[PDB]
Amino acid sequence: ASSVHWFRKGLRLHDNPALLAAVRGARCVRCVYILDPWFAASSSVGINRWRFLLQSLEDLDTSLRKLNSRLFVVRGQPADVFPRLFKEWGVTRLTFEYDSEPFGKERDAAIMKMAKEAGVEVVTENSHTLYDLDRIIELNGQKPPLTYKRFQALISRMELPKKPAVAVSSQQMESCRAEIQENHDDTYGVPSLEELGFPTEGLGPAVWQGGETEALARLDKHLERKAWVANYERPRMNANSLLASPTGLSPYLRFGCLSCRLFYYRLWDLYKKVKRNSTPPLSLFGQLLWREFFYTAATNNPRFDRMEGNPICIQIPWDRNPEALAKWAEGKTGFPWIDAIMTQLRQEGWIHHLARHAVACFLTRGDLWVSWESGVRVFDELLLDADFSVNAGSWMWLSCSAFFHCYCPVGFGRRTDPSGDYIRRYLPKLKGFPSRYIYEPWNAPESVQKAAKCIIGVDYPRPIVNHAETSRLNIERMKQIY
Amino acid sequence: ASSVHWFRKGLRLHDNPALLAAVRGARCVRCVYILDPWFAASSSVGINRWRFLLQSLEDLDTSLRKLNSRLFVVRGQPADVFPRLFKEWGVTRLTFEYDSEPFGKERDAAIMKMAKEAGVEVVTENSHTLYDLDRIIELNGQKPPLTYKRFQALISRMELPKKPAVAVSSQQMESCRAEIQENHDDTYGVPSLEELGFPTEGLGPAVWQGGETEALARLDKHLERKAWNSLLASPTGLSPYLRFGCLSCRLFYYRLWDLYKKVKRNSTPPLSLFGQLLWREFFYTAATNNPRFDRMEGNPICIQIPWDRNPEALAKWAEGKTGFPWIDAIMTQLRQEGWIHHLARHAVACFLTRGDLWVSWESGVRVFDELLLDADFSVNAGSWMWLSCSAFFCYCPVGFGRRTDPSGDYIRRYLPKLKGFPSRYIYEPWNAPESVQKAAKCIIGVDYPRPIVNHAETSRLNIERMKQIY
Ligand SMILES: COc1ccc(-n2nc3c(c2NC(=O)C2(c4ccc(Cl)cc4)CCCC2)CS(=O)(=O)C3)cc1
Ligand SMILES: COc1ccc(-n2nc3c(c2NC(=O)C2(c4ccc(Cl)cc4)CCCC2)CS(=O)(=O)C3)cc1
Numbered sequence: 001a002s003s004v005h006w007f008r009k010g011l012r013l014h015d016n017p018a019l020l021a022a023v024r025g026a027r028c029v030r031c032v033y034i035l036d037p038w039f040a041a042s043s044s045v046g047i048n049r050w051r052f053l054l055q056s057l058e059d060l061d062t063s064l065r066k067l068n069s070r071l072f073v074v075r076g077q078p079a080d081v082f083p084r085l086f087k088e089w090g091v092t093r094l095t096f097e098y099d100s101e102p103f104g105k106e107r108d109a110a111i112m113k114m115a116k117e118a119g120v121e122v123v124t125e126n127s128h129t130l131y132d133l134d135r136i137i138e139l140n141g142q143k144p145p146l147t148y149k150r151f152q153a154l155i156s157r158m159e160l161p162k163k164p165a166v167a168v169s170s171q172q173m174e175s176c177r178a179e180i181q182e183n184h185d186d187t188y189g190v191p192s193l194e195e196l197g198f199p200t201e202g203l204g205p206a207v208w209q210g211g212e213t214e215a216l217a218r219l220d221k222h223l224e225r226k227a228w229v230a231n232y233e234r235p236r237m238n239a240n241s242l243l244a245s246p247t248g249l250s251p252y253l254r255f256g257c258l259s260c261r262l263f264y265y266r267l268w269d270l271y272k273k274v275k276r277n278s279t280p281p282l283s284l285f286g287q288l289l290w291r292e293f294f295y296t297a298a299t300n301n302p303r304f305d306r307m308e309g310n311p312i313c314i315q316i317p318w319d320r321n322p323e324a325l326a327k328w329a330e331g332k333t334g335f336p337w338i339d340a341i342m343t344q345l346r347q348e349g350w351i352h353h354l355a356r357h358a359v360a361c362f363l364t365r366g367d368l369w370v371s372w373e374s375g376v377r378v379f380d381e382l383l384l385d386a387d388f389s390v391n392a393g394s395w396m397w398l399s400c401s402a403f404f405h406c407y408c409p410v411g412f413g414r415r416t417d418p419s420g421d422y423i424r425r426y427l428p429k430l431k432g433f434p435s436r437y438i439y440e441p442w443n444a445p446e447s448v449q450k451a452a453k454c455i456i457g458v459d460y461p462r463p464i465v466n467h468a469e470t471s472r473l474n475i476e477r478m479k480q481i482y
Numbered sequence: 483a484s485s486v487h488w489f490r491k492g493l494r495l496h497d498n499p500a501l502l503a504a505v506r507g508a509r510c511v512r513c514v515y516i517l518d519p520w521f522a523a524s525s526s527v528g529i530n531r532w533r534f535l536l537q538s539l540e541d542l543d544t545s546l547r548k549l550n551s552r553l554f555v556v557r558g559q560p561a562d563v564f565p566r567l568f569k570e571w572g573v574t575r576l577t578f579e580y581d582s583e584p585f586g587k588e589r590d591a592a593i594m595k596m597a598k599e600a601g602v603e604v605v606t607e608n609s610h611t612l613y614d615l616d617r618i619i620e621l622n623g624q625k626p627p628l629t630y631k632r633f634q635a636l637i638s639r640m641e642l643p644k645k646p647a648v649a650v651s652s653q654q655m656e657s658c659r660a661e662i663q664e665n666h667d668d669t670y671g672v673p674s675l676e677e678l679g680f681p682t683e684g685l686g687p688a689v690w691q692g693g694e695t696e697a698l699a700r701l702d703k704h705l706e707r708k709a710w711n712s713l714l715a716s717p718t719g720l721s722p723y724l725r726f727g728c729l730s731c732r733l734f735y736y737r738l739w740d741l742y743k744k745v746k747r748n749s750t751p752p753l754s755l756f757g758q759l760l761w762r763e764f765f766y767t768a769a770t771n772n773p774r775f776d777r778m779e780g781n782p783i784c785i786q787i788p789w790d791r792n793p794e795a796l797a798k799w800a801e802g803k804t805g806f807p808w809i810d811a812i813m814t815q816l817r818q819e820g821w822i823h824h825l826a827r828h829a830v831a832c833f834l835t836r837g838d839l840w841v842s843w844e845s846g847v848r849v850f851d852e853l854l855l856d857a858d859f860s861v862n863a864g865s866w867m868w869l870s871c872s873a874f875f876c877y878c879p880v881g882f883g884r885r886t887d888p889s890g891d892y893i894r895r896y897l898p899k900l901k902g903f904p905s906r907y908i909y910e911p912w913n914a915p916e917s918v919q920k921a922a923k924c925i926i927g928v929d930y931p932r933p934i935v936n937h938a939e940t941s942r943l944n945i946e947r948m949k950q951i952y
Binding site: 143146303308309310311312313315316317319320476477480 | 702706714894
């Protein structure tokens, strides 16, 4: 069989059941990622997401080099490109990891009709989530669970997630090794950021290096007996927690560089080694289960990112404030805690969930009363660990539109990091301000601002809203809705 | 048998007994909608209704493609088109859902005359209503019931509505699949808004996506919510779909019933569970034999009230430029989206009729017929007579808005020029100080119209004129 394995997510060779199906009885397997580099014709995607993807494809290709093979990066769009690929490569089989997200399910349904007409066999495996999501939905009566509680109860009734699949054999991959022509880097090679026109000048190393290899090293470090004390047995918020952890796994779960089933059972085995008990609580896998919740709710709701027409979403008359939204998006709100977080997210592609709470609150029910839909757009451009289902679900959750209390954009920062070094790291123009005034620089005496070489209104923007006044208005609005 | 199933309402494949009749024993079945493109010869229909209709026809075509058939959209008028179509297709049978409304019933009678002359069998089914309206009328002495209590009394003595018929077989549709020429889209395609002369620049997604698929999806999400109040359009709202026939009323009826049996042990629900469906039914029952149902003069059930003729005021009410932000936002939302809340209809209808302007309900009927998605002849005309106290026997245009939405964000959503005003003045911007208006960047009388009438004066005078009627 002539098999093409299609990489989209599942950017990994481990726990790749779709890759296994391509290799089983294959004279030739070609591993493909179809990349559209025409950025102006799509919604904006930040350099961090692109750099991460490119580093994930470089790792896939490096790893396929060890198997006497290569990664084929075909530049274009999958619907336009596949028909020529089926004919040029004599493709008899196409395999890819299932995409439950509705727009991805729509694209993949079109690709499958095109392959059936071509006579290409299609095989899919759902190694992106712990469970079969449709199974979860059948058991809830063919509707998706609408609360986290009900979702937990449905999976409490189900079998354990499938164990991670064995990786493809080196011998097996030699058997189906594709003929690699010497012009491969020029046609099918993994592009650099510079080739794609990105500003690579003076660009630091990525805080979140992409790729399966990085994810696997991070998994091992994350699941060391020492670290389990820090992040599992006794979780506590440090100002160091705001900064990116070398053991964080969330970007790699999003891109598929780390199998969620592999994480799930490796974490389970750590639990068995730390506590002789073999039965962990579901809260142990909380992040993975919230992930799985949002994928379950969104798989049949194509309006999942919208308010209007979205059956699960409360309809709320959000303010239209494009200039506030842009100031929020660019870290120019004048609230250093908010601006430091948005700066970090833009520069690095990850922020702490606490930092997401503060920043999503400031845009929505906390301050600006701007729709969560806008916040979804920005996080899609910048945030590395949340796709359609997790990003929209989290925003609706935070805004109280589907499925807490919003904190002070000044006070919450002072409580999380009283030093203000987080502020100084990401808003250097405020480095001169003392810790008492760095979260309220508009309240520092002019003598303090002159000493800091930072004049509020000129060097750093004054606060764009009065939090006392906006929260009063917003709290009464929330009392009406509820 | 060569069968033509005629879509008018009943824009759905589920609970479509007329389509089941066309398919059974048929060599060929053709699903037809007859669209008059000449818009200016008929009365005005807003873009939202046209959009909802095209999306419902598009859904029906998509539904039929999955059965290896197509929807024939035939341009013209049914009286002209059907003789030519019956001979060109060798039609042996015409089927459609019964239309109880008086004007459609006269049309359908004419079509059945031509069909009989051509030898074409006609079958009709009453799947737009829960009941046989004519049986309800029988039980009232062959006169329509004029109170909701009499209506409930009659239907509580009747049998239960017919359960929804099963959708048609995919295999059966193949046996009567019609020949589809490659020129089909050129002749029988579903037109687009652009092709019908509508401006579509800047047109976002419809707030109320048309079609059966949407309707069935909303119905499930509506029952799931009930198992587990705002002025904004609900993503589980069902009412546009019942008007267009995208959602079967009987399906809604019995699924709502089954929900009652699951939640409450009692398998005997109250009539109030179907209140909206029963108000729907009441008006269809009252209108079916009254050709003057939408007018005041010559309407036997309507109280003759000396309404004022004020066309300019009527025009400002329809365009939402009355100067009352509460009334104008509602009218803007109706014009923009195609649906407004029932208490918003109340406020807006009182303002035109007995509350302030004292314009006839018949004009409010005409405006709603252009803009409103969920009310056809019987329901829209009956609601206006009911509200105006003209048959079937008010709140402040500032206070009722302040009480309904103290935030005023509903005003700001649809009247963006008033966004600057604080909540204490956004329902009465004429009482806002001149500085406040300059800070809001909206000067009353220039950027936004002053209120066309004084409510204190007109409401006392109009309550006196209503008293003279009684
Ligand atoms: C507001 O914008 C966003 C905030 C968070 C995310 N996000 N990204 C990932 C995950 C989440 N969401 C969460 O964990 C929760 C959450 C929600 C809202 C907030 Cl504010 C914080 C947390 C969902 C309910 C409780 C925890 C889990 S993951 O692996 O599945 C990676 C995305 C966008
Ligand atoms: C004033 O213009 C209109 C107001 C309402 C409608 N309308 N549309 C539908 C329905 C109704 N009417 C009602 O239910 C009532 C009603 C009457 C007057 C008002 Cl103001 C509000 C409600 C009738 C008596 C009590 C409830 C039920 S339906 O499915 O049958 C869809 C149409 C036009």
